[PDB]
Amino acid sequence: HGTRPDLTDQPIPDADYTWYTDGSSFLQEGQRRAGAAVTTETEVIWARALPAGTSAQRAELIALTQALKMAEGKKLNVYTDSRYAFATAHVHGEIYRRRGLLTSEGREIKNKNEILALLKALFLPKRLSIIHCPGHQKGNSAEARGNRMADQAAREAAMKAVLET
């Protein structure tokens, strides 16, 4: 009956997990490869290649949803460099849903299944903060390094999937 009331856009001090998520989509070998990743600053929690033709935005969505699922029952601070993802999570998703636009035949909305999955995932974490930071930062700050880590994780996930076959 609605979205998660306690969802916040700022870091919570006591969090169990501080993560970073990134999607990526490029054309490799005359084909669109995508990948998604959830990592800490120093280590990769989860990374996967995604079905061909997957957009960057959708990849972001999937990465985020994954972070949520893995964070179930715990306290999560998750950083995303995607304004699209951040917005969808905080605002657009719940509106689309409550409108009945997500389950309709209308393709005027993109990544409907991802959106639904995410809306469902938002309830898993005990306490949740989805924060947005500009990605690919020149800065040396922990969040910049986190973002770079995630980015590299996703891209590696895709490239690796391509050349293992």
Ligand X SMILES: CC(C)c1ccc(O)c(=O)c(O)c1
Q: For binding to ligand X (CB under 6 A), which residues are involved? A: 22, 24, 56, 60, 81-82, 135-136, 151
- Least Å distance, CB 152 to ligand X, is 10
Q: Rule CB under 5 A: which of 3-62 touch Mn ion?
A: 22
Residue 39: how many CA atoms within 13 Å on its side-chain side? Answer: 26
DSSP secondary structure string, 123-145? TSBSEEEEEE--SS-S--SHHHH
Phi, psi of 22 (to 5 degrees): -150, 140
Q: Rule CB under 5 A: which of 78-137 touch Mn ion?
A: 81-82, 135
Closest residue by beta carbon to ligand X? 82
The C-alpha angle 62, 14, 133, rounded to 5 degrees, equals: 45
143 in contact with Mn ion (CB under 5 A)? no
- Least Å distance, CB 158 to Mn ion, is 11
Q: Which residues bind Mn ion (CB under 5 A)?
A: 22, 81-82, 135, 151
